[PDB]
Amino acid sequence: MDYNFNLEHPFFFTNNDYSTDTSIKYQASLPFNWHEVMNNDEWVYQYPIGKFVERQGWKIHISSEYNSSHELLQDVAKICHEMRIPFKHLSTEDKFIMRNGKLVSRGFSGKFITCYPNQNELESVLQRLESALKQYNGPYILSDKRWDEAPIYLRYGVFRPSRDDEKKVAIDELIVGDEVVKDERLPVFKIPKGIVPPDFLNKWLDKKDKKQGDFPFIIDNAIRFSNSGGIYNARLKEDGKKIILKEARPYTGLGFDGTYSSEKLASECKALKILNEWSEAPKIYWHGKIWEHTFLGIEHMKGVPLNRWVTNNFPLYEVVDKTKDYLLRVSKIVEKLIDLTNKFHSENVYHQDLHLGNILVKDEDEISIIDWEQAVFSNDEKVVHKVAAPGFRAWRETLPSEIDWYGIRQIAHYLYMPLVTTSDLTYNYVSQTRIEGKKLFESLGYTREHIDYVESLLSYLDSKCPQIENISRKKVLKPMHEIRTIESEQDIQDFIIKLLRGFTLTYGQWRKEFQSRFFPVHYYGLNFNQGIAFSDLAILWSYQQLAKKVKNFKFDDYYEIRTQVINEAVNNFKKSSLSGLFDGKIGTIWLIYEFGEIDRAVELFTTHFIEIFENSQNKNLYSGQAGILLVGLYFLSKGEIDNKLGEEILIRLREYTLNYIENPETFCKVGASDVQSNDPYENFGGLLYGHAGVAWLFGEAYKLTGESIYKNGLELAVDKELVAYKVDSNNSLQYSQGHRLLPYLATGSAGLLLLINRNKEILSSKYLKYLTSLERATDVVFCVLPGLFNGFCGLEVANNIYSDIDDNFSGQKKLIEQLYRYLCVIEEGFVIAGDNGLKITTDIASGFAGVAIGLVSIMDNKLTILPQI
């Protein structure tokens, strides 16, 4: 459920073309001399044949409830088929669920039938429609104004695109006066900039009801808004008290089953009425009905949520935790959860939504369960668990009491090893965390008795949930049961063979039911097809680079798919509109060169390099100008081009260096930043984004020829980039971004540790003193993401890469024996869930290609994603 992002669908993600069918339509009984047009796959528009309509005017908005939705069509279309009024309405029932549901914005809420009366015939339309319906009801629809006692709503808007015999006016602008005015969609009603109403509307606009003002609330803030309402922070006006305010507009907040927000609110009110003697449960101070929004106020608990408490108390370092004392607190919290669950299961209530956002941990380790919004009060049935957090949803129908135990089991397993995200893809995934948390806690060094007590508690929690037969089309994905220990190279060969076999299995399931791409990919780059990024050509390149390290692979269908990928990559080369190393046209040239194609790469290179270099805008490594110069310097260093083109490349590289040394602040961000996200085109700090990409180019230019201005620019860039870094309490240098610290390969600490290790012979003694500080920041024991750009593989490919030692067995052993906690299997296979596990993907940032490049770069000591020499 919970679509949008991009969508549902087992295993892979997909584009926004999957919401197909299976709901009954509305089908409003067309007469003759008319016509119905299905245009935007949401609305059917009926035009009377041979009638001129007027641009702008006053639209008519009609709302509806779910139970009596089918009667408004037969009572409004009967009105509109006599005379001549064109109207449009929704087509499928699913979009009627979604339009009045929880997900959509407050601007588009409740629009179900829209009428288009003309200017001189609106009187009879409204006078007939007021006495026509008179009994049905629905939501208010914001950004509009009500009529007297009907679901009729009015608005001044646009009717249709511009006529051929009129001035060309865009959809977003009006024609009031001689000026064009862009309209806005704000939740309150505003007359759009002085449009003169007709004489009959002045009575309906300018009137005022009774001014009896008695509001027993002082609203201070509002933490979050929704379609149902908002959750305010206020105080009572009796004497004092801090209250948490909830509201729910009538006939909205609708779910896929027929159940509104008021029923959930009343269930919350009853459930907190029953539990009215426990300090570790909220209490109700006020229940009422102001106008028709049915306000509820409940008391405000104190503490931090368990999600922040895990990150504040898990040992992420060997030195961050002192005098042990962590597992006994976990056992105490699990014992409190068991006691609470038994106590409110004895009182015949069922909380039915137990995830990390509800348990609040206050001072001295006391819990308090909040958000009793989907409570039920009967246990003899078998229902489907409908609304849940990601990773806390039950499987294949159960009793209303076992959903609480299924929640509590994974809350306890998250507190032992924080990886429960992929539990919506693999059944019984937490057994892997149960197995592999014990190895981590033994390697850190702990008393045995705490481990036995915690494992006894997890066994007791496992014993009170039923094993359910997995029939959900996701049966193939099964967790591990046996974990080995790597002691020789044959285990590494076996793991490599299993990983390529898992890639072979995950190719076919994507290619069987889709054809728009060739490999599945994370949803940030669902529409990108070029560069060292979310793509498809780097997948085959990493597959070749890993398969060359294993002797005599099965070699299924390699050459055919290589032929179509290498043909399709060059077939649409100039149809793109981006230029850059990692996301543009110059990256695929280097990858085509990396397969081979020595004539083809030079033929594309000499034809398109000048046009690619002139139209570039930015000046960073990821999508700017430095990557194209790096590719040109690589091609000059190997040598496949003419002398004058290389002279132009060197002249423009000197021009770039001279522009950089004058003012460095033009094309970067020297600061600390205030926005935190995983978006690729939003971060400006790191190796891919910022000064380290410039320093890599300066190091390559110094290694090519040897001008001292490149060394000066590199030293200036390194001294500028270390301004953004801070020092924590553990004496470690980390990148700073908002309230978060990011030691990672791409956007953080490991990029500089790789860069100053690559140039140890050129740099001097005033710059190498940060290596001990940076190595203490990339020695973590656990991180959530398994990827290459911002995951564990990026941390371990750069911690021991160059080192002037050929000892590579220890790094491979550590990487393989610690990366086992992120995987599942398929049939003698191996697939890796990517950032935000709830997926399987093959892409270079978080997936198969990232760990393939990690193993290849650990073996060959090159980091084969940035060109060098």
Partner: peptide, 24 residues
């Protein structure tokens, strides 16, 4: 409570105090 109406209607503005889409 009568003649209120406008009150709540207005209420719908205030101002929040200072990823993972798809609701919960």
């Amino acid at each position: 409570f009568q003649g209120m109406a406008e009150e709540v209607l207005n209420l719908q503005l205030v101002s929040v105090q200072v990823x993972x889409x798809x609701x919960x």
